[PDB]
Amino acid sequence: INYYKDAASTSSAGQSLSMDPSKFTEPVKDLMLKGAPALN
């Protein structure tokens, strides 16, 4: 129950439960498959 009118006044947000490290761990242009050779 929100007792207040504005959105800033609500409690903390709830877990992204998004999670996708590939923008950070695999930003390569041509896709690399694990097990296939790195450099062909």
């Binding site: 007792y3 409690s11 903390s12 950070f24 761990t25």
Partner: protein, 236 residues
Amino acid sequence: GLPTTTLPGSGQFLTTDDRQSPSALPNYEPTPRIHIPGKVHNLLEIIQVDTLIPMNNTHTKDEVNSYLIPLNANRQNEQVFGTNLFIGDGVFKTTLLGEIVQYYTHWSGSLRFSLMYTGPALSSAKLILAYTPPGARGPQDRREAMLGTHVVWDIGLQSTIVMTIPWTSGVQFRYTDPDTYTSAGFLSCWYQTSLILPPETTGQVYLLSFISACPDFKLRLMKDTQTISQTVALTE
């Protein structure tokens, strides 16, 4: 008027509680969000990116050189480097992994340790990396080392080798600040055959080493880092 009773704890301020508050700026409209590449949602997303370990810690002032593990041509049977696995201290401590682990009290999971070779292309080498699970001493010679988790690495076209320290543990969590009961083992590396340089070439070659966490990893019970402190408030 509805009858109430107040409980113990009334009026306390707990920095970790999460409740509603009146907005000081009623009706204000925040700036629209635009798109920005790079959004982070979990610290677990970022500790999977690998970063360099200053393994060569033996210097006396911080230098680019403590990131370089040297290799000697023609040595046989001998040991390249050694370290315990207290990820919250020692070599690990300044790495991104080490640096985040320090915001939490407990960790569990597998670690990924990789070595990228930088020697001339016409050289060759075979190294053994060994993980020694808790309970034995840091290995003292390859024979001792080779009886635990190990990978023979053959230096080739493919420049890096990724060793995993699989989670070996009785207790399902270990403390990030070094603790005995909770200790994780040792990591050592030895010549399997030996580094060989081509003609017209000389000196030391170096390995770069990285650390990142496997998708396996768990961190819990947040706390304050020993890695930052201060004596007076900062001014402009």
